[PDB]
């Protein structure tokens, strides 16, 4: 596990933590799980149906 030479590498999630905190958003969770239920596809489908209705009965 010897650290590399040249310029010591920074873990990508550490870099993202610093970047996100620089912009005021919350830092990396490192413990959050996935949304197994109610997936992105389901959310998009709901948006699709309401968009279809609103456009139809504009």
């Amino acid at each position: 596990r010897h650290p590399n030479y040249g310029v010591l590498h920074v873990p990508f999630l550490d870099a993202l933590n610093k970047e996100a905190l620089a912009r005021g958003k919350d830092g990396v969770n490192m413990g959050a799980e996935y949304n197994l239920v109610f997936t992105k596809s389901m959310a998009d489908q709901v948006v699709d149906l309401i968009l279809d209705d609103v456009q139809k009965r504009v």
Binding site: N4, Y5, G6, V7, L8, V10, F12, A15
Partner: protein, 55 residues
């Protein structure tokens, strides 16, 4: 006769030669073990977490 037993043919080393050889060998070993395993500067590392770049 066993003419190559321990008791026969012992030639003591002169003190001057003994000292010279000892100094030479110790110096050579110390210098080599130092410059080979200690003066190894190409194994350079820089610690600077601000040099990372993410888009």
């Amino acid at each position: 006769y066993f003419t190559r037993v321990h008791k026969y043919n012992h030639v003591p080393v002169p003190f001057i030669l003994n000292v010279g050889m000892s100094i030479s060998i110790v110096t050579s070993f110390v210098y080599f073990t130092y410059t080979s395993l200690w003066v190894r500067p190409e194994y350079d590392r820089v610690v600077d977490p601000s040099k990372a770049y993410v888009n």
